[PDB]
Amino acid sequence: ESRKIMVPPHRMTPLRNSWTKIYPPLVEHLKLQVRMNLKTKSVELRTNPKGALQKGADFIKAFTLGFDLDDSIALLRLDDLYIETFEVKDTGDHLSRAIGRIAGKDGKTKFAIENATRTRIVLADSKIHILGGFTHIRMARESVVSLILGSPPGKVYGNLRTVASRLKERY
Protein backbone atom coordinates (compact mmCIF):
# COMPACT_ATOMS: atom_id res chain seq x y z
CA GLU A 1 0.00 0.00 0.00
CA SER A 2 1.38 3.25 -1.31
CA ARG A 3 0.75 6.93 -2.05
CA LYS A 4 1.95 9.22 -4.85
CA ILE A 5 2.42 12.96 -4.36
CA MET A 6 3.14 14.96 -7.51
CA VAL A 7 5.85 17.59 -7.01
CA PRO A 8 5.18 20.56 -9.29
CA PRO A 9 8.04 22.10 -11.27
CA HIS A 10 8.22 25.17 -9.05
CA ARG A 11 8.93 23.33 -5.77
CA MET A 12 11.32 20.76 -7.23
CA THR A 13 14.79 22.12 -6.50
CA PRO A 14 14.07 22.91 -2.79
CA LEU A 15 12.82 19.33 -2.44
CA ARG A 16 16.10 18.02 -3.83
CA ASN A 17 18.39 20.21 -1.76
CA SER A 18 16.42 19.79 1.49
CA TRP A 19 15.67 16.16 0.65
CA THR A 20 18.33 14.91 3.07
CA LYS A 21 16.31 16.36 5.97
CA ILE A 22 12.97 15.14 4.59
CA TYR A 23 13.50 11.39 4.20
CA PRO A 24 15.07 10.59 7.67
CA PRO A 25 11.81 11.11 9.67
CA LEU A 26 10.09 9.33 6.77
CA VAL A 27 12.35 6.25 6.92
CA GLU A 28 13.23 5.81 10.57
CA HIS A 29 10.67 7.71 12.66
CA LEU A 30 7.94 6.73 10.29
CA LYS A 31 8.88 3.24 9.12
CA LEU A 32 7.89 3.75 5.48
CA GLN A 33 9.95 3.14 2.37
CA VAL A 34 10.28 6.17 0.12
CA ARG A 35 11.15 6.60 -3.56
CA MET A 36 11.31 9.75 -5.68
CA ASN A 37 10.24 9.18 -9.28
CA LEU A 38 12.38 11.42 -11.48
CA LYS A 39 10.25 10.42 -14.49
CA THR A 40 6.79 11.44 -13.29
CA LYS A 41 8.17 14.11 -10.89
CA SER A 42 6.53 12.33 -7.99
CA VAL A 43 7.13 10.97 -4.51
CA GLU A 44 6.10 7.39 -3.81
CA LEU A 45 5.57 6.15 -0.26
CA ARG A 46 5.17 2.40 0.18
CA THR A 47 4.52 0.43 3.35
CA ASN A 48 6.85 -2.36 4.48
CA PRO A 49 5.73 -5.37 6.51
CA LYS A 50 8.02 -4.06 9.25
CA GLY A 51 -1.69 4.36 10.14
CA ALA A 52 1.33 6.52 9.30
CA LEU A 53 1.31 6.45 5.49
CA GLN A 54 -1.22 9.28 5.52
CA LYS A 55 1.04 11.19 7.93
CA GLY A 56 3.96 10.86 5.52
CA ALA A 57 1.70 11.83 2.63
CA ASP A 58 0.64 14.99 4.47
CA PHE A 59 4.30 15.71 5.31
CA ILE A 60 5.43 15.65 1.69
CA LYS A 61 2.15 17.21 0.56
CA ALA A 62 2.76 20.19 2.83
CA PHE A 63 6.23 20.55 1.36
CA THR A 64 4.66 20.20 -2.10
CA LEU A 65 2.04 22.85 -1.28
CA GLY A 66 4.66 25.37 -0.33
CA PHE A 67 5.26 25.11 3.37
CA ASP A 68 8.87 25.08 4.49
CA LEU A 69 10.88 22.26 6.00
CA ASP A 70 10.36 22.98 9.70
CA ASP A 71 6.70 23.74 9.02
CA SER A 72 6.31 20.37 7.32
CA ILE A 73 8.04 18.65 10.26
CA ALA A 74 5.60 20.52 12.51
CA LEU A 75 2.79 18.99 10.46
CA LEU A 76 4.40 15.53 10.67
CA ARG A 77 4.54 15.77 14.45
CA LEU A 78 1.94 17.75 16.46
CA ASP A 79 -1.26 15.70 15.98
CA ASP A 80 -3.54 18.74 16.47
CA LEU A 81 -2.32 20.44 13.26
CA TYR A 82 -4.34 20.81 10.06
CA ILE A 83 -3.92 22.61 6.74
CA GLU A 84 -6.67 24.15 4.61
CA THR A 85 -6.40 24.96 0.89
CA PHE A 86 -8.60 27.31 -1.09
CA GLU A 87 -8.44 29.39 -4.24
CA VAL A 88 -9.71 32.96 -4.15
CA LYS A 89 -12.49 32.81 -6.81
CA ASP A 90 -14.83 35.20 -4.95
CA THR A 91 -8.45 39.92 -13.77
CA GLY A 92 -7.12 43.37 -13.01
CA ASP A 93 -9.92 44.35 -10.64
CA HIS A 94 -10.68 41.43 -8.40
CA LEU A 95 -7.94 38.84 -8.82
CA SER A 96 -4.96 41.13 -9.33
CA ARG A 97 -5.39 43.18 -6.17
CA ALA A 98 -7.29 41.05 -3.66
CA ILE A 99 -4.08 39.07 -3.43
CA GLY A 100 -2.20 42.34 -3.09
CA ARG A 101 -4.57 43.13 -0.24
CA ILE A 102 -3.80 39.81 1.48
CA ALA A 103 -0.10 40.50 1.04
CA GLY A 104 0.32 44.23 1.61
CA LYS A 105 3.60 46.06 1.32
CA ASP A 106 6.41 43.54 1.90
CA GLY A 107 3.83 40.97 2.98
CA LYS A 108 3.21 42.71 6.28
CA THR A 109 -0.53 41.98 6.34
CA LYS A 110 0.14 38.28 5.80
CA PHE A 111 2.81 38.38 8.51
CA ALA A 112 0.39 40.13 10.87
CA ILE A 113 -2.43 37.65 10.32
CA GLU A 114 0.01 34.74 10.72
CA ASN A 115 1.26 36.01 14.07
CA ALA A 116 -2.20 37.04 15.26
CA THR A 117 -3.99 33.79 14.48
CA ARG A 118 -1.00 31.47 15.19
CA THR A 119 -1.29 29.87 11.77
CA ARG A 120 1.10 30.24 8.94
CA ILE A 121 -0.03 31.02 5.44
CA VAL A 122 1.53 30.45 2.05
CA LEU A 123 0.02 32.70 -0.57
CA ALA A 124 0.46 31.61 -4.18
CA ASP A 125 -0.98 33.61 -7.06
CA SER A 126 -4.53 32.87 -5.97
CA LYS A 127 -4.01 29.68 -3.94
CA ILE A 128 -4.01 30.23 -0.18
CA HIS A 129 -2.87 27.43 2.10
CA ILE A 130 -3.11 27.77 5.89
CA LEU A 131 -1.38 25.56 8.48
CA GLY A 132 -2.71 25.76 12.02
CA GLY A 133 -5.06 24.29 14.56
CA PHE A 134 -8.75 24.01 13.78
CA THR A 135 -9.88 27.23 15.48
CA HIS A 136 -6.74 28.99 14.29
CA ILE A 137 -7.45 28.03 10.67
CA ARG A 138 -11.04 29.21 11.19
CA MET A 139 -9.98 32.66 12.32
CA ALA A 140 -7.18 33.12 9.78
CA ARG A 141 -9.51 31.97 7.01
CA GLU A 142 -12.27 34.31 8.19
CA SER A 143 -9.84 37.22 8.13
CA VAL A 144 -8.42 36.27 4.70
CA VAL A 145 -11.94 35.91 3.27
CA SER A 146 -12.71 39.26 4.90
CA LEU A 147 -9.94 41.14 3.18
CA ILE A 148 -10.60 39.58 -0.19
CA LEU A 149 -14.29 40.48 0.13
CA GLY A 150 -13.68 44.03 1.29
CA SER A 151 -13.21 45.23 4.85
CA PRO A 152 -11.38 48.27 6.21
CA PRO A 153 -7.78 47.78 7.35
CA GLY A 154 -8.73 49.18 10.73
CA LYS A 155 -11.52 46.61 11.03
CA VAL A 156 -9.40 43.63 10.06
CA TYR A 157 -6.48 44.76 12.23
CA GLY A 158 -8.69 45.32 15.27
CA ASN A 159 -10.17 41.89 14.70
CA LEU A 160 -6.62 40.51 14.49
CA ARG A 161 -5.65 42.06 17.84
CA THR A 162 -8.83 40.72 19.43
CA VAL A 163 -8.45 37.23 17.97
CA ALA A 164 -4.84 36.95 19.18
CA SER A 165 -5.93 37.81 22.72
CA ARG A 166 -9.04 35.60 22.81
CA LEU A 167 -7.25 32.62 21.25
CA LYS A 168 -4.50 32.73 23.83
CA GLU A 169 -6.93 33.31 26.73
CA ARG A 170 -8.11 30.67 29.12
CA TYR A 171 -11.79 31.48 29.76
Place this chain on the structure above:
RNA sequence: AGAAUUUGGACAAACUUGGUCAUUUAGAGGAACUAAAAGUCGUAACAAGGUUUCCGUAGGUGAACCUGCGGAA
Protein backbone atom coordinates in the same frame (compact mmCIF):
# COMPACT_ATOMS: atom_id res chain seq x y z
C1' A B 1 16.75 122.75 -55.40
C1' G B 2 19.15 125.46 -51.62
C1' A B 3 22.45 128.46 -46.14
C1' A B 4 22.49 133.05 -43.31
C1' U B 5 20.07 137.65 -42.78
C1' U B 6 14.61 137.98 -43.02
C1' U B 7 8.32 140.47 -45.62
C1' G B 8 3.93 138.31 -43.68
C1' G B 9 3.78 134.98 -40.19
C1' A B 10 -0.01 131.52 -37.50
C1' C B 11 0.52 127.03 -34.48
C1' A B 12 2.93 126.56 -30.24
C1' A B 13 5.44 121.91 -25.87
C1' A B 14 7.24 123.31 -21.27
C1' C B 15 7.99 127.30 -17.05
C1' U B 16 5.02 131.38 -13.98
C1' U B 17 0.02 133.81 -11.23
C1' G B 18 -3.89 131.78 -8.84
C1' G B 19 -8.41 129.08 -9.97
C1' U B 20 -13.75 128.77 -12.43
C1' C B 21 -10.74 123.80 -9.91
C1' A B 22 -9.33 119.21 -7.06
C1' U B 23 -6.33 118.57 -2.86
C1' U B 24 -3.42 119.80 2.27
C1' U B 25 -3.01 122.80 6.49
C1' A B 26 -0.31 126.04 11.87
C1' G B 27 -3.22 122.51 13.19
C1' A B 28 -7.32 124.09 16.61
C1' G B 29 -12.29 124.53 17.88
C1' G B 30 -17.89 123.01 17.92
C1' A B 31 -20.39 118.43 18.56
C1' A B 32 -23.21 114.34 16.78
C1' C B 33 -23.02 109.16 15.46
C1' U B 34 -20.62 104.31 15.08
C1' A B 35 -17.09 100.77 16.74
C1' A B 36 -14.42 98.72 21.33
C1' A B 37 -12.88 91.39 23.40
C1' A B 38 -11.46 88.41 29.54
C1' G B 39 -10.94 82.23 28.22
C1' U B 40 -4.61 76.52 30.62
C1' C B 41 -4.71 73.27 27.18
C1' G B 42 -6.19 70.30 21.78
C1' U B 43 -3.32 66.21 18.45
C1' A B 44 0.09 65.02 13.81
C1' A B 45 -4.04 64.71 13.02
C1' C B 46 -3.07 64.22 7.28
C1' A B 47 -2.65 58.65 3.63
C1' A B 48 -2.13 53.97 -0.43
C1' G B 49 -2.30 48.43 -0.12
C1' G B 50 1.72 42.01 -4.42
C1' U B 51 4.06 38.09 0.00
C1' U B 52 6.24 32.94 -0.75
C1' U B 53 8.84 29.22 -4.14
C1' C B 54 10.75 28.27 -8.73
C1' C B 55 11.96 29.51 -14.17
C1' G B 56 13.90 32.62 -18.26
C1' U B 57 16.31 37.09 -19.65
C1' A B 58 19.32 41.99 -19.01
C1' G B 59 22.68 44.40 -15.83
C1' G B 60 25.71 44.45 -11.43
C1' U B 61 28.54 39.62 -12.12
C1' G B 62 33.01 35.71 -6.38
C1' A B 63 28.25 32.99 -12.93
C1' A B 64 26.69 32.61 -5.98
C1' C B 65 23.64 36.36 -4.90
C1' C B 66 20.97 41.09 -5.74
C1' U B 67 17.95 44.31 -8.84
C1' G B 68 14.54 45.26 -13.10
C1' C B 69 11.41 42.99 -16.66
C1' G B 70 8.54 38.49 -18.52
C1' G B 71 6.09 33.94 -16.90
C1' A B 72 4.51 29.45 -13.47
C1' A B 73 1.96 27.68 -8.85
